[PDB]
């Protein structure tokens with residue numbers, strides 16, 4: 001059970017550097033469009049209250065410089081600009097010759113995706129995250145990583161689901177979907193904002209306990225059961241998400257012979273403390289492995 | 300708040316090929332005019348118990364090997380010579396990889412981290428990072444057909460290829476070769492049950508993790524007491540720890556925190572007998588999978 005990411009080559013070929021005035025960050029070049037956070041337009045003196053409608057008017061095509069450093073370089077010419085929620089949509093006069101087949105879909109809490117971290121348009125690392133129940137993610141993002149993208153891949157099709165926007169007050173990160181909406185509705189300004197409480201992703205904890213059983217670690221399995229409806233009542237009071245079963249979870253239950261409701265009961269007990277014991281090299285519950293992850297990696 | 304980070308894999312993806320010999324197929328690494336792959340692709344499927352690789356090489360002919368590139372513009376690559384180096388084959392092909400990165404071949408040491416590109420049938424499917432264990436295995440996520448998958452580090456634009464995947468051991472752990480051809484831990488590429496040595500804690504990585512704990516406000520384990528490196532290292536031989544070897548990366552953590560290596564070596568001796576009633580970054584067990592370099596670049 002390792003933290004697995006998709007191979008990043010397809011997305012690396014799309015990363016560019018976008019500069020506007022004194023701001024520089026990353027953009028995603030797909031066909032004739034370069035996507036980037038709209039806060040590239042924010043002046044250094046208006047961090048706390050930018051008017052993005054106003055800033056958009058004051059811009060022309062010549063206000064944005066776009067450079068591709070990786071691979072086959074350029075030196076793109078911006079020939080149009082528009083704003084879409086919290087994103088800039090720049091039109092450039094060359095279609096990216098390495099554009100993958102792609103879609104734009106918003107991810108839901110508990111779902112995993114790969115992130116390609118970039119600085120000044122250069123990819124530097126990749127890792128996998130889950131969208132937290134409070135619509136934040138915990139990866140490794142340093143200064144200038146804005147515009148780094150998160151994505152999944154199915155067959156030949158990349159689903160772009162995240163473009164990094166900002167660090168929040170609790171050391172945590174959020175970003176936009178490519179429809180322009182910010183995950184969790186955070187504002188792209190220097191302003192005090194509160195994030196809701198995080199929660200354990202119940203269905204991923206279930207998947208992880210199934211991975212433990214599959215690896216011969218089942219000391220926590222009892223005959224006792226908690227129904228889904230009763231677990232979901234308990235979860236509201238203990239910062240767990242609502243458990244929603246899936247065909248992926250059912251495959252693990254069939255394979256191990258341990259019912260979902262046995263693991264729901266185990267979670268309730270393990271939340272109280274592991275006593276002196278370990279599960280898959282961990283002394284706490286793990287909720288960043290999805291049922292699909294466990295099925296892929298162990299079956 | 301450490302995360303498992305891998306290098307972007309695009310450069311390496313462009314070098315992966317599929318190598319077929321008889322009815323056996325696995326992955327190869329295409330650099331300049333050479334394709335590297337595990338020599339057990341020559342082993343007949345009924346003869347896994349103990350092959351004679353010197354003889355198998357002799358019996359190979361002009362067209363015993365088929366190499367296919369699937370990524371990019373697909374192509375058959377004609378094999379024009381074949382050599383053996385340790386547990387790897389070195390196949391000469393008549394076309395040079397037009398996307399050969401600047402590269403070296405260095406053997407990694409236990410405790411060091413590297414990125415792995417997992418492939419099947421010459422097609423990359425995922426990337427993850429591991430540390431070389433003290434018993435010269437790695438805890439990867441590798442399924443059947445992953446042989447030939449490659450591990451590597453990067454410095455600047457130079458890729459250091461350090462691992463080519465060879466086999467899965469009885470305990471689910473994995474081993475492979477360095478590109479000089481030597482199998483890590485001298486494991487034999489035969490269908491023979493063989494014994495891996497007992498694992499150990501990577502001492503320099505536990506030190507790194509204690510430094511990350513101190514950087515995040517968790518320092519209750521720091522006392523004035525010191526254990527010298529030489530004293531720690533003799534203790535380590537009897538208590539399942541690797542020898543401690545300092546590096547410039549560790550030194551930078553010492554400077555940032557004002558805590559000396561020898562204070563943490565003392566602390567490790569105490570934490571090994573027990574955390575008593577406390578936790579370190581929420582955990583009650585020692586973490587040795589993050590390197591000094593990881594902590595320096597992430598915190």
Ligand SMILES: CC(C)(C)c1ccc(N(C(=O)c2c[nH]cn2)[C@@H](C(=O)NC2CCCCC2)c2cccnc2)cc1
Nearest residue numbers: 024025039042047141142143144146166167188189190
């Ligand atoms: C203009 C605006 C909206 C206030 C803003 C300012 C800076 C950035 N940050 C850029 O690093 C960066 C680089 N280029 C442009 N911005 C960083 C960032 O969020 N600091 C926040 C700290 C206080 C709350 C507001 C901003 C950042 C660091 C590490 C990982 N992720 C992002 C993001 C948004």
Ligand SMILES: CC(C)(C)c1ccc(N(C(=O)c2c[nH]cn2)[C@@H](C(=O)NC2CCCCC2)c2cccnc2)cc1
Nearest residue numbers: 325339342347441442443444446465466467488489490
């Ligand atoms: C010929 C030789 C040396 C005995 C051998 C045979 C099979 C493989 N394995 C290939 O999957 C595979 C695919 N193509 C060629 N080999 C698998 C493997 O190690 N089973 C071991 C089982 C008992 C001990 C011998 C090998 C494998 C599975 C998952 C992840 N990693 C490797 C590796 C080496």
